[PDB]
Write a protein that binds this DNA or RNA. Structure first.
Lengths: 113, 113
RNA sequence: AAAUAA
């Protein structure tokens, strides 16, 4: 499209549950009351959501919401992931995404305490 | 205080470490993902935290924090225990603490795994 | 069995 027309970007970032079994990443990404994710979107000027299987603190509600069929719950069949999104001019859109994907690496490795 | 004004209650509940040596009660109480403790508050309408010496899984981390001197770690000198807390009008609060105190006894017995 | 939930 047009180089100065604002654009919407989106990239699904897989959360490594197969490589780090049993570690609660969702708690780690959000931190206390979500201020580790609030702060991480503010830092990079993107918007981030944790979607997919297990993104919700229960198998059951997340299973029902999933069996409902509504498009808003399409993500709960996909693997657990963070969806980073940005709306800005193209040069800015890709640059912040690139920025955002560098600062998120640390939340996708365990704490070892 | 006043009969329908809300009050705070707290009651330490001791964990029998002398009686079942080396049994991990902390894991039993929190279960997976911390949700057997979390469900036990929802059922009883209380709030619960595990404090005292041995509440943390790293004995040297816990002794740093204990030395550190901050009031938030004062509990790491007391015996290992669950501190049940409630904020409600007196009638409800005492009824919930009691409910919680019967419903907590199951978790103060080891599993023989 | 280890408590962060936007």
């Amino acid at each position: 499209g047009a180089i100065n027309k604002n654009m919407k970007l989106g990239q699904k970032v897989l959360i490594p549950v197969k490589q780090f079994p049993k570690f609660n990443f969702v708690g780690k990404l959000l931190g206390p009351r979500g201020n580790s994710l609030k702060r991480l979107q503010e830092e990079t000027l993107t918007k981030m959501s944790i979607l997919g299987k297990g993104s919700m603190r229960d198998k059951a509600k997340e299973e029902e919401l999933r069996k409902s069929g509504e498009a808003k719950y399409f993500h709960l069949n996909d693997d657990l992931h963070v969806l980073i999104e940005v709306f800005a001019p193209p040069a800015e859109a890709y640059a912040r995404m690139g920025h955002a994907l560098e600062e998120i690496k640390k939340f996708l490795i365990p704490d070892y305490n």
